[PDB]
Amino acid sequence: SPGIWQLDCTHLEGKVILVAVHVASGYIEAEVIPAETGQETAYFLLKLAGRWPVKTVHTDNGSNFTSTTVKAACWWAGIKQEDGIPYNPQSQGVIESMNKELKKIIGQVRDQAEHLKTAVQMAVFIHNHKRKGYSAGERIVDIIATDIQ
């Protein structure tokens, strides 16, 4: 569980927001891209895995699961690439709610930036710092530190 992440792709303003969620904590990273491609996904995972100890990624769709570019990045970064089938139905709901939450935050900050990417990074900040009490940022660090010890 310390090492398990889930990919998630959502759309706004004719652009794609690619999100990785640390399952156990709810901590996220995100970026705006013109379109989801294998190359964009591969690069995003390479970034993520240099920053956090990513053991397993549940891909967001079959195209990213299939993509040899994505598989190559997962190989490079030592990530187990897995499907994203919601064997637990709770997971669909969790991601749906998360996408709705993020879009709400982006709306709340949208006038504070010209570019969507800026607003998305503001939303990442607010999401990760929000106390639910601990924040997602606190939880991911505690979970991983506990694992290291």
Ligand X SMILES: C=CCN(Cc1ccccc1C(=O)NCC1CCC1)Cc1ccc2c(c1C(=O)O)OC[C@H](CCC(=O)O)O2
Which residues sit at the interface with Cl ion, rule CB under 5 A?
A: 53, 128, 137
Tokens coding 24: 């156990």
Does 32 interact with its own copies (rule: CB under 8 A)?
no
Q: Tell me which residues in 39-68 interact with its own copies (CB under 8 A).
A: 43, 46-47, 49-53
Convert 18-81 into a string of H (helix), E (strand) and C (coil): EEEEECCCCCEEEEEECCCCHHHHHHHHHHHHHHCCCCEEECCCHHHHHCHHHHHHHHHCCCEE
- Which partner from the list Cl ion, ligand X, its own copies, none does 132 bind, CB cut-off 5 to 8 Å by kind? none
Does 76 interact with ligand X (rule: CB under 6 A)?
yes
Judged by the rule CB under 6 A, the positions of this chain that interact with ligand X are: 37, 39-40, 42-43, 46, 69, 72-73, 76, 112-115, 117-118
